[PDB]
Design a protein around this ligand. Structure first.
Ligand code: HEM
Ligand code: HEM
Ligand code: HEM
Lengths: 726, 308, 726, 83
């Protein structure tokens, strides 16, 4: 029951493109990729080769195929301790999933700053460009359970644990620069409204349902982040191709005690890219693990996710200089007003070994800050600081969750706390309190200072009465949604209108639809009319006369809010489907593969069955997947080489492959006799921008396809796809 | 008062076809449908209309929109016990999902025998055709988590809790008449092989991956239930149009002490029906809650699932 | 700088006698002591000196005396993550105590066999006299909670974890050779009857209440272990001076497959010794931690607890050769019929570092056996096999309790079990199932064999119907109690009578006392009449005429069942109280102390205040404790040297000290004018056996005292004590 | 949360209020109350916003904190008055 004699059960421990080898635990795939945190986990990594199978008590098992019984057709005996231990462990494998962001995918990596930031912060991890800090990053969706789909429409989480020399800092962010609500007291209300409804627990992974849109229509502070969710920001192509934001204003504190306000940004060095809705929603059915798989495979291929940490910095004296409150998490700080200053680079370069032990059990919490950072009075952040330590008591089984290996600091930690469930650390200190004389008061407090000092909070002045009251400066809800809307390209605006139209069409109670369209009319009448038209609603004269909200500090637009207005494409790590036939023209395939290789773009060779096909020169081509098995949804572009095109010309799946890719605005390239497929997608003889065609694949043909890929999708084709039956 | 003045927020408490009205909790949609178990749950049913919002300690809340802070732009105070109770409760809402059959959809109902079976069993619930036993039934898939999709290819669970006069009897079955393995000692091996692979936790809801088929290839006892999963039995149209089976031979024991071997079956009175694969897989994207929805909406329409 | 300048805060890291230095964590007190399990725990031991105080996330704390507030008299802020982490950990410190045996005290040590037992067992740990196996042993009571007193009347547990090269073997025994009930299905009923009654949760640590005696009176199978409990076996002097037993018949399996029935024994090398009831009960008030303290201090002094493992062996073909069933755990195997064969020695030589992490979290379970052992069908053992795995799921938080450091095997353990709460091990195996090909089926099953083989159960024949039925062979309840009773000395019998009389006087419902007396009449009339007389119950003519049960295989007694019938005293590690005065005769003190030192007997110097006193010749004598502060209960003998006796002659506490020690049968020695204390204990001028007296404290005065100590108590004194008001 | 097993410790009979209690809190380990409210959030329209907030007042009013004035800097410091 054993491995094949040729060793093909085991993936090469070298970088390989997606699909070339089975995926594997990180430490077996990239044994030479190390960092201080990865090394520190060696105490708990367990191998397997050459070891006997045992009980958890170390007793060798002789027969792991049978229960102990009285005769071979008899009853199972209660003294079978080997069966009972194995089945008890199984029966208790599950722990509670995270209340929100339960679906997530994680990896290890490292960060380093470009230059010392000691003038603005005393944080040790930002102090030296050559001091590297290991990180562990989890990306997530928000609403759905741990078993829900990846390419839903949702906000995405982007949480980074930095294992610094002065403590763990967790930067627990999302992929949009604001949140839906202003004060943490409403968090359970908002979450309950977006989550599956309580009677029947439907719908999973979707805000397209009555209670969410009821809450939005009654709480206009949500509209800004709803605009982001309804745009293509809600459906990223990959966690490598989205932005990250800390949302809140925090403080940096330097060694002289000066505070600067800061908001944190991650910029994806692979560029910004998102799916289109029909593609995203179909991909939730064809590969619900699409983002998890793409992240793992990019890392196995060497296409490591890279992101640039950036800070927007506002001096303390400029707190009130904007037309919005800096402490309001439903407001963004436009980059035209305050630029993002580049701070450092993070590279994710190794996958975990075991998803449960590393990803499921990791705990991130934004209250895990270090000296040189501090909080502000943002009322959403303030409440988050309560929740993330509280929730681990049930999720991770008690107060020792920091001794779960992935969560452990790699710097020293010593204190007088003791006991609690599954306590690992055995304290030898004769004292468990301070002040003590019996251990000469160790471990000891440390004064604050420029480096290696104790934490002290910035001594912000507090003046007010004890109130449960929203600041009046937070009571403006329409100007930021409007700025976002005006900053999108025309096709991005069309997709926003489509996202609201789709969602509100699934709200069963029509008055809720009407109320949301009335909110939209307070943002932009063109948006509101376009959504109302799709819903069969007519705006009233009063609604047509609503005065637009003001510009944000004079801005009519900020192009940094668009995914696509400023080119930033990077094709390395993208994937193309190559539709084979049973006699491929090998000179076309040579040229295609050579050009793709030079840009780091991967290929998947598809056919109408699995196994191999032979090219015209005898080259044996292994088939990665069938046309139906790996649909166009899973790739960025489609190329069809010449050869025996009659083999595939009338194959329904191959023709549909091209029609789906066309509808979803992907570049298509057709060589030689593959040009007969132009007829399936109605391309004119003269050609169309976005369809590359020629007698053969060559240098010019591939350069054109690759230029298309750098622009991600063929937006000009949009008016031509409504007629296509696909 | 946020409800529309026309009363359109509230579904009619009468049978209505799918999509005609918003769905509702069963006791609000069908208040006059009763059985002995549903009546016994009255002690714990909590309403809401006309009551004041309170903490869990019964203290009325005045402002459920704001944390307590020192100044309206100031820091939140630790003495805000109303915020901390609400968020504590929220923070501990989740419990572990079931190790298998975590994705399932349930409903209440009742069972009645056609005739007394006292000649073959002394079970009280099968003793008298006029004796009604309340039931609660959960249908499920096997591999995926509680937030996975309904129309995956998988075996389905079909579990029935009979609330009898002589104790709870749970008939915990599936939709095929056999299982993949012979001895319980192998259940964690089989389940680990069909569940998402342990390095990366992929794939959800699918046996279409190397470790499942590795196990199958090495344990030919699995081939019979794999045949059923690969057939259209693995993609039912609805929980109403699949069969149920207890799988195992059990015994019936009569009052004279005679044992008879028995295997349990459920026949769907709606008939048997399945999807085709491309449709099932696509539907897991277009509506991952399709079976849970269809069950709930068939009951709200009066198309009650019936099984013999 | 809080430690005193002279270093007197820190205990000497060397062996010191009880009271000489404060006690300390074991790795600080005895850094040189080691074994393979103590070495394997080093990876989780945490130090303290010279480290900064931090959060659990490694952030250094500047001020650990204050919460963060708005103004120094203002409200505490929610953003104080340092205060909330420290209070959260504190708030979750406690875990469920064990359902039974909650009160217990533990130590590390080692075991070695005297010779290889390969002819009868293939167990690795017994295969080589040079093979040393680390152990961890916890001693306990049964009924009380974790915070109940040590010197209650109760059965004691004696549980040993052997960390062998082939797995953890736990020998989970008690200090009597039988248990109270026959079938595990009754365990919850019996334990609920002995436990505090459910309305008011009284009494703690006591069987002297109506429900316990109700159950006993209705369940005569309990009477054997109840006889042991009522005897002085119920009140051991120390865990060092009690026997241990596995109770059940198990099997040994050799390399040829031959099974031998075995019962396990621990023999205390310090000998057998118990308190008397008034002393035990009073000590629960004056020092409820007396046995935990004695164990810890013995190990700090080098008076290591030592036990000899022994086996009673019966060949398979002798299964039915006795008048009682080998599988009945309410029957003992008399040593007159089946001798105990010495097997090896265990020495406990290191205390834990942290009581919660090592003692509270240790899990012992009798199902934890290794190749070379197996179970039998004893129906009490059979049920135990279920409970000990199950109960850990709530007590220790889940199925990973073997990864808590104290529980971890020191031998390899590898299997396909995964996840669960608190998962520490990070599995790198590509497979989590077997059979697999993708990891070449590792880790792999191992066939049984003579060494290092897989576990296989002995193929015992089973034949019968499925029944809920007690074997008729278990239905005999009185013969083993009568053997025990007849094996006791006359003074032991008196203390048994007094144990039942005291307990039954606390039973409020008189009929239950009557029903218990009726059971005693089926055991021995003399016993029953003597209890009855103390309860004001008169036996009926029918009770006077019950035929005594038969002898057991011809035995009318077995002296191995008595604590005292066969002298086995050792004075090493006992303690004497020396009562000082303000002008002690130094020649007396020098001779006493020299003699006690030579035999390894400790002393405590007592007076009426703390500080020091000065001897007649200028020597300064440090006082350990006051008369009231270290009462006679806590010592084994009392010596009063000469000097200024008038200083203490009319000190009530000093007088009371000697009356208490006299009542409790302890040797008392009086030198010179200290003989004036003869009047307080009503001793005649010619003296009496058990009171040592002379003009000075040598020639033979200390030899006389030491011979009295080797015999433990002065049993001949018992007639005289009733006339002492103490 | 650890001692009594989760956040529904108020449903343990001795801890239950004798007066009404209704809110939008749901689930948690060993949840006894079966809520029938169509809504588990507020503000909601689908249950006309019930159960509803109550302004503070002389009797049967909602809880409001006394509006004590707070003036100071954020500090970890013992008042000198306590020394
Ligand atoms: C700016 C607004 C917020 C952002 C950007 C945010 C971000 C996130 C992210 C990314 C995660 C997933 C981390 C992971 O991968 O494990 C998470 C989890 C969580 N958040 Fe937030 N969050 C926000 C607001 C809140 C609020 C207002 C609360 C409640 C007071 C809250 C409580 C929680 C809890 C209980 C978890 C699960 C934590 C765990 O079990 O480890 N969050 N949040
Ligand atoms: C005849 C083969 C089997 C059938 C028909 C079957 C059926 C089911 C069903 C339908 C459920 C879901 C119950 C629900 O809806 O709540 C379930 C749950 C479960 N089963 Fe099985 N099962 C089989 C084999 C096994 C085996 C071999 C084991 C382990 C020894 C096992 C252990 C479990 C466990 C731990 C659960 C979760 C139950 C809970 O959390 O309450 N099952 N089973
Ligand atoms: C000969 C009869 C028995 C003997 C000699 C015995 C011995 C012991 C001892 C010495 C302990 C304390 C172990 C420690 O220090 O952690 C213990 C604990 C325990 N025993 Fe027994 N026992 C007996 C019968 C039973 C039975 C019949 C059951 C139930 C079927 C049971 C269930 C337990 C449980 C639940 C614990 C606490 C274990 C833990 O929490 O880890 N025992 N037993």
């Amino acid at each position: 029951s054993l491995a094949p004699e040729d060793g093909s059960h085991r993936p090469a421990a070298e970088p390989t493109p997606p699909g070339a080898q089975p995926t594997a635990p990180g430490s077996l795939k990239a044994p030479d990729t190390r960092n201080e945190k990865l090394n520190s986990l060696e105490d708990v990594r367990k191998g397997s080769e050459n070891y006997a199978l045992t009980t958890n008590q170390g007793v060798r098992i002789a027969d792991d195929q049978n229960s102990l019984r009285a005769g071979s057709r008899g009853p199972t005996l209660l003294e079978d301790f080997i069966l009972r231990e194995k089945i008890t462990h199984f029966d208790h494998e599950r722990i509670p999933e995270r209340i929100v962001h339960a679906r997530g995918s994680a990896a290890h990596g490292y960060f380093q700053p470009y230059k010392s930031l000691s003038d603005i912060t005393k944080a040790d991890f930002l102090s030296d460009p050559n001091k590297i800090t290991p990180v562990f990053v989890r990306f997530s969706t928000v609403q759905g359970g741990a078993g829900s789909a990846d390419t839903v429409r949702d906000i995405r989480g982007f949480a980074t644990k930095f294992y610094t020399e002065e403590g763990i800092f967790d930067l627990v962010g999302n992929n949009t620069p604001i949140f839906f609500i202003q004060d943490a007291h409403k968090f359970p209300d908002f979450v309950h409204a977006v989550k599956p409804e309580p009677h029947w627990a439907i719908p999973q992974g979707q805000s397209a349902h009555d209670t969410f849109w009821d809450y939005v229509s009654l709480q206009p502070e949500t509209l800004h982040n709803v605009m982001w969710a309804m745009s293509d920001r809600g459906i990223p192509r990959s966690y490598r191709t989205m932005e990250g934001f800390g949302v809140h204003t925090f403080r940096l504190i330097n060694a002289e005690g000066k505070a600067t306000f800061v908001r944190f940004h991650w910029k994806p060095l692979a560029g910004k890219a998102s799916l289109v809705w029909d593609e995203a929603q179909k991909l939730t059915g064809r590969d619900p693990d699409f983002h998890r798989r793409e992240l793992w495979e990019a890392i196995e291929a060497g296409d490591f996710p890279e992101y640039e940490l950036g800070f927007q910095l506002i001096p303390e004296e400029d707190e009130f200089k904007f037309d919005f409150d800096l402490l309001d998490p439903t407001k963004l700080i436009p980059e035209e007003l305050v630029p993002v200053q580049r701070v450092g680079k993070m590279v994710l370069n190794r996958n975990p070994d075991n998803f449960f032990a590393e990803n499921e059990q990791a705990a991130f919490h934004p209250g895990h800050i270090v000296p040189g950072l501090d909080f502000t009075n943002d009322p959403l952040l303030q409440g988050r600081l309560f929740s993330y330590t509280d929730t681990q008591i049930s999720r991770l089984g008690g107060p020792n969750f920091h001794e779960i290996p992935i969560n452990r600091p790699t710097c020293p930690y010593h204190n007088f706390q003791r006991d609690g469930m599954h306590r690992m650390g055995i304290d030898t200190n004769p004292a468990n309190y301070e002040p003590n004389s019996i251990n000469d008061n160790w471990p000891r407090e440390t004064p604050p200072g420029p480096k290696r000092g104790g934490f002290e909070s910035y001594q912000e002045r507090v003046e007010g009465n004890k109130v449960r009251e929203r600041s009046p400066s937070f009571g403006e809800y329409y100007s930021h949604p409007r700025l976002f809307w005006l900053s999108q390209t025309p096709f991005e605006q069309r997709h926003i209108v489509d996202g609201f139209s789709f969602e509100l069409s699934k709200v069963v109670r029509p008055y809720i639809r009407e109320r949301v369209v009335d909110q939209l009319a307070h943002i932009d009448l063109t948006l509101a009319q376009a959504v109302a038209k799709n819903l069969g609603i007519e705006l009233t004269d009063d609604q047509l006369n609503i005065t637009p909200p003001p510009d944000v500090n004079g801005l009519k637009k900020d192009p940094s809010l668009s995914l696509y207005a400023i080119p930033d494409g990077d094709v390395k790590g993208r994937v193309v489907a190559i539709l084979l036939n049973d006699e491929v023209r090998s000179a076309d395939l040579l040229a295609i593969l050579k050009a793709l290789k030079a840009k780091g773009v991967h290929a998947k060779l598809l056919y109408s069955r699995m196994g191999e096909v032979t090219a015209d020169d005898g080259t044996v081509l292994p088939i990665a997947a069938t046309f139906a098995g790996a649909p166009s949804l899973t790739v960025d572009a489609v190329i069809v080489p010449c050869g025996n095109i009659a083999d595939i010309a009338d194959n329904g799946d191959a023709n549909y492959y091209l029609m789906e890719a066309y509808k979803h605005l992907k570049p298509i390239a057709l060589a030689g006799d593959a040009r007969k497929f132009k007829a399936t997608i109605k391309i004119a003889d003269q050609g169309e921008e976005g369809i590359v065609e020629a007698d053969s694949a060559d240098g010019s043909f591939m350069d054109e396809l690759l230029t298309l890929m750098a622009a991600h999708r063929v937006w000009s084709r949009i008016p031509k796809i409504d007629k296509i039956p696909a």
